[PDB]
Amino acid sequence: DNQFYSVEVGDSTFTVLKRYQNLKPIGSGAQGIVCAAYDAVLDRNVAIKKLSRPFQNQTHAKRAYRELVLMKCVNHKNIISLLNVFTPQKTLEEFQDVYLVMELMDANLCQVIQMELDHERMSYLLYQMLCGIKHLHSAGIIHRDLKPSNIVVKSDCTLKILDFGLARTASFMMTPYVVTRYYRAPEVILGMGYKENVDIWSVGCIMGEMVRHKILFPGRDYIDQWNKVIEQLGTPCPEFMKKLQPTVRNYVENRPKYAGLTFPKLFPDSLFPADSEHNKLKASQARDLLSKMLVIDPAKRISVDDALQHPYINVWYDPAEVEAPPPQKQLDEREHTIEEWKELIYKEVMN
Numbered sequence: 201d202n203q204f205y206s207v208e209v210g211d212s213t214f215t216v217l218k219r220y221q222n223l224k225p226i227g228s229g230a231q232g233i234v235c236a237a238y239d240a241v242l243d244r245n246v247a248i249k250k251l252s253r254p255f256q257n258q259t260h261a262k263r264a265y266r267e268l269v270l271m272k273c274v275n276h277k278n279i280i281s282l283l284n285v286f287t288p289q290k291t292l293e294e295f296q297d298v299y300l301v302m303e304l305m306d307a308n309l310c311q312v313i314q315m316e317l318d319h320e321r322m323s324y325l326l327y328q329m330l331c332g333i334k335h336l337h338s339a340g341i342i343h344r345d346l347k348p349s350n351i352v353v354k355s356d357c358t359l360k361i362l363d364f365g366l367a368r369t370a371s372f373m374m375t376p377y378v379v380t381r382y383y384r385a386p387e388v389i390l391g392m393g394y395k396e397n398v399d400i401w402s403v404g405c406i407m408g409e410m411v412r413h414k415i416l417f418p419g420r421d422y423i424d425q426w427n428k429v430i431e432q433l434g435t436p437c438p439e440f441m442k443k444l445q446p447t448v449r450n451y452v453e454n455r456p457k458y459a460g461l462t463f464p465k466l467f468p469d470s471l472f473p474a475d476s477e478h479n480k481l482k483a484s485q486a487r488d489l490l491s492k493m494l495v496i497d498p499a500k501r502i503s504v505d506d507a508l509q510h511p512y513i514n515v516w517y518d519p520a521e522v523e524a525p526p527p528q529k530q531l532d533e534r535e536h537t538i539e540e541w542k543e544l545i546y547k548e549v550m551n
C-alpha cells in the first residue's frame with residue numbers, strides 16, 4: 201500500500217501524500233522547490249515546499265533544521281505556520297527529502313511592490329510585517345535578512361513572513377543562485393553586532409521600494425551596496441564609527457565622503473498619492489516613518505515598538521496582534537557532519 205504518488209513538476213519530481221492534488225509549479229530556488237496543490241482532506245489550497253537532501257551540506261542543513269524547529273515553536277498569523285511535514289522515505293537510511301506544507305497565498309511581496317498602492321494597503325502591509333517581527337523578537341528570534349521575496353500576501357492584503365533569517369552565530373554552497381543582500385542593515389553589511397532594530401532597516405528598505413519602485417540600495421556586493429547607502433543618506437556620525445572593528449572602521453572612515461540627501465529629496469511628493477487632504481497628510485507621515493527607519497546608526501534608528509506607535513502605522517494597532525504570547529531547542533546553533541545533520545533533521549520530521 202502506498203500513501204504517496206509521483207509527478208514531475210518542472211524539472212523536479214514531487215512525491216507527495218495522495219491528499220495533495222493537481223500540483224502546479226510556483227518556482228525553484230537554491231534551497232527549495234515550491235508548488236501549489238489542492239488538499240482533499242482539508243478541502244483547501246496549499247503550498248508545498250520540497251527540500252532535496254537538505255543535509256547535503258552544513259549551510260543547507262543548519263538552515264533546514266533551524267527552520268523546522270522554529271516553525272513548530274512560533275504561533276502568529278503573520279508568520280508561516282506549518283500545516284504538515286512529511287517524507288516519503290521510510291527509514292533514516294533511505295531518508296532523502298522533506299516536504300513542508302502551508303496555506304496557499306496569492307502573491308509574493310516583490311509583485312505587490314510593483315503595484316501602485318494606496319496608503320491603507322501600504323500601512324497595513326507594514327503593520328503586519330512589524331507584528332511578525334515583534335513576535336519573532338519576543339522569542340529571541342532576530343531575523344536580520346528580511347526581504348520581499350520571502351514574504352507572501354493574500355488578495356485581502358494579509359501577509360506572512362516565510363523564513364527566520366540568519367544563523368545567530370553562523371559559510372559556502374556550490375549554488376547557481378546568488379543571495380539577495382539589498383535589505384540588510386548596515387550592522388549586517390559591516391559585521392557590527394546588532395539588536396532588535398536591525399530588522400527595522402529591512403522594513404524601511406521595503407517601504408522605500410514600495411514608494412520609489414526601485415531597489416534603494418542595489419549593488420554587486422557589499423562594497424557597491426555601502427556606496428549606495430552613504431551617497432543617499434550620508435556618512436554616519438563619529439559615534440557610529442567607534443562601534444566598528446578597526447579594519448572595517450579604516451575602510452568606512454576612508455570612503456569618498458557624502459552629506460546625504462534629505463528625505464523630501466529622497467522621496468519627492470510626485471511619488472506619493474496627494475490628491476486629497478487625507479493622502480497629503482499620509483504622504484507626510486509615510487516620509488516621517490521612512491526617515492526614522494532608514495537611519496544608518498542603530499542607536500538612532502526607531503524600534504519596533506515605536507514604529508508600531510507611529511501615526512502611519514498605529515491606525516491598525518490591535519493588542520491581540522501586537523502583544524501575542526511568545527513562542528516556546530536551546531542549543532540550536534551547532535556544527536555537524538552530513539550524517540549527523542541527516543539524523544537531526546530526520547528525527548524532527550518524524551517527531
Ligand SMILES: O=C(C1CC1)N1CCC[C@@H](Nc2nccc(-n3c(-c4ccc5ccccc5c4)nc4ccc(O)cc43)n2)C1
Binds near residue numbers: 235248349352
Ligand atoms: O503563481 C503562484 C501559484 C499559482 C502557481 N503563486 C504566486 C506567488 C505566491 C504563491 N503562493 C505561495 N503561498 C505560500 C508560500 C509560497 N512560497 C513559498 C513557500 C511555499 C510553501 C512553504 C511551506 C513551508 C514553509 C515555507 C514555504 C514557502 N516559497 C516561495 C517562494 C517564492 C514565492 O513567490 C512563493 C513562495 N507561495 C502562488
